[PDB]
Amino acid sequence: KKVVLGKKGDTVELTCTASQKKSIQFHWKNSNQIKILGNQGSFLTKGPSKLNDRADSRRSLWDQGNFPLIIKNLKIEDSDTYICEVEDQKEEVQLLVFGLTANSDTHLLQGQSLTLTLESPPGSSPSVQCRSPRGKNIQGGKTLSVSQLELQDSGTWTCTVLQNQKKVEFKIDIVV
Amino acid sequence: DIVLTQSPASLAVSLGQRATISCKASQSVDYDGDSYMNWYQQKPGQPPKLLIYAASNLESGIPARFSGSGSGTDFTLNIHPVGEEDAATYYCQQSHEDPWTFGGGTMLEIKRT
Amino acid sequence: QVQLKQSGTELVRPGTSVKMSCKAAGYTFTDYWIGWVKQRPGHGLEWIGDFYPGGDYTLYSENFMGKASLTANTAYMQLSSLTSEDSAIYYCARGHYYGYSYAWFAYWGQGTLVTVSSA
Amino acid sequence: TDDYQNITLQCRIKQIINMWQGVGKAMYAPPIRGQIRCSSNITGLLL
């Protein structure tokens, strides 16, 4: 039950795996038994779901024994489980996609506070561990705020997010 | 980088006359017997349209008034019957090896009474 | 049938970064490269870089290092350190992948104008 | 709920195809001049 993390805008590879090496059938159904992708001979056939124009596959690795699934421009509404059906198994993976950013676009002054907004899928409890070049290793829950935003605090602070022991790095836009 | 030279720089064509434009290449573009030439047409106020490809295989929509021939470093794009709407500039392009280089462009203006 | 559309004319100051958009049409766009083209009078027309959406691959020429940048059905451009020399027309083409991306492609786009001026 | 003599289907030939016995594009020679016809019988249907 491997679990992977996203960044709400980047790519990801949820790869199945087999051993025959003969370009065999497979599919990628979500948690609602709805098709998304799947080999049909040597062609491709996107499923009638809400991931029409984003789904794709590496059509050159189907012969080696790997059937990845590249989804571009990830969105919050995609966090869910996925199932391979390579030959007879039920190889399953979980995906969790969220975004942590700021609200003040550019207008910021020295001596004010900094606030972060993290949009995790409902029913999730990520941990926000800020890491900064100044050493302010601020630790807290999903929502974290900084009471000091000075000139020395310039640069993108690295508030990583940890969930199930897996850590994903972020960046914060600071304008002063 | 290959250097492509299109000739002549200027040309005059009378109506209903065969028109030929030549293209010279510094380095051979051949691979497995193929000619990797692309010919484009350009009219003022509008973008270029792909005219011919491969020097041996024609496009759709464009009439059969067109052809390309040659070998190696010497190619020729040929047009018949030259009409009124063909007054334009023509470009020869190599697709064999990067970087994608260019020529100087060949003008063609219809000559009438 | 593939059709390419480009945004309106742009007039920008020099030395800044300029954003361009070339929207696709009702075609997959996922297995096709996209070449970006610059045209200036008395020069013919030159290519900047070629960008593949099916993997976000990049192919550059030896004349646009540190100036051009490409991103990914709505592709975009990223030009940095703009100068008066870049006031010109810009186009986006279609293509393919799996080799011979632009070896025998077709179906060009319309174009847009960029003016680098302080007036 | 379909209708109420001839149903027309537009068709466009191609010259660059994708092989069915593997992975990879392919190209063929230019099309023929004209006067191409086909009369066929339909027997089955895959869904």
Domains of chain B (ranges, CATH numbers): 4-111 (2.60.40.10)
Q: Are strands A28-29 and A35-37 parallel, antiparallel or unpaired?
A: antiparallel
Domain boundaries, position C37: 5-116
Report the distance separating Cα C23 and Cα C4, nearest Å: 6
Is the CB of D27 inside 8 Å of chain C's CB atoms?
yes
Amino acid symbol at B69: S
CB distance from D11 to chain A under 8 Å?
no
Q: Does D30 touch chain B (CB under 8 A)?
A: yes
Tokens of A142: 């999903």
Q: Is D18 helix (H, G, I), strand (E, B) or coil?
A: strand
> Helix, strand or coil for residue A151?
helix
C46:B103 CB<8 A: no
Cα(C72)–Cα(C95) distance, integer angstroms:
15
DSSP tag of B34: B
Q: What is the 3-state secondary structure (H, E, C) of C57-104?
A: EEEECCCCCCCEEEECCEEEEEECCCCHHHCEEEEECCCCCCCCCCCC
Q: For the purposes of burial, counting CB atoms within 10 Å of the CB of A93, is it exposed (0-12), middle (13-18) or buried (19 or more)?
A: middle
> Which chain B residue lies closest to D28 (C-alpha atoms)?
B57
- Chain C residues with CB-CB distance to A11 below 8 A: 56
Q: How many structural domains comprise chain C?
A: 1
Distance (Å, whole) CA A170 – CA A105:
16
A75-86: b (≥16 Cβ within 10 Å) or e: eeebbeebbbbb
Q: Could you tell me the CATH number of the domain that includes residue C24?
A: 2.60.40.10
**Residues in B touching C38 (Cβ below 8 Å):** none
Resolution of this structure in Å: 3.9
Question: Using CB atoms within 10 A of its CB, is residue B73 exposed (0-12), middle (13-18) or buried (19+)?
Answer: middle
Contacts of A12-16 spanning 24+ positions with Cβ under 8 A: A12/A70, A12/A71, A12/A74, A12/A95, A13/A68, A13/A69, A13/A70, A14/A68, A14/A69, A14/A71, A14/A82, A14/A93, A14/A95, A15/A66, A15/A67, A15/A68, A15/A69, A16/A66, A16/A67, A16/A68, A16/A69, A16/A84, A16/A86, A16/A91
Q: How far apart are CA A107 and CA A101, in angstroms?
A: 15
Name the token pair of C105: 């492609």
Cβ contact D25–C104 (<8 Å): no
Q: Are D45 and D39 in contact (CB under 8 A)?
A: no
Choose the mutation target among D11, D13, D14, D15 for the interface with B, i.e. most B CBs under 10 Å. Answer: D15
Distance from CA of B17 to the nearest CA of C (A): 26
Q: Beta strand C88-92 with C34-39: parallel, antiparallel or unpaired?
A: antiparallel
Q: Tell me whether residues C62 and B91 touch, CB distance under 8 A.
A: no
Q: In Å, how far is D7's CA from the nearest CA of chain C?
A: 22
Contacts of A41 in chain D (CB under 8 A): 20
Q: For chain B, first and last CA: distance in Å?
A: 44
Q: Which two tokens stand for residue B14?
A: 């009378």
Contact C25, C92 (CB under 8 A): no
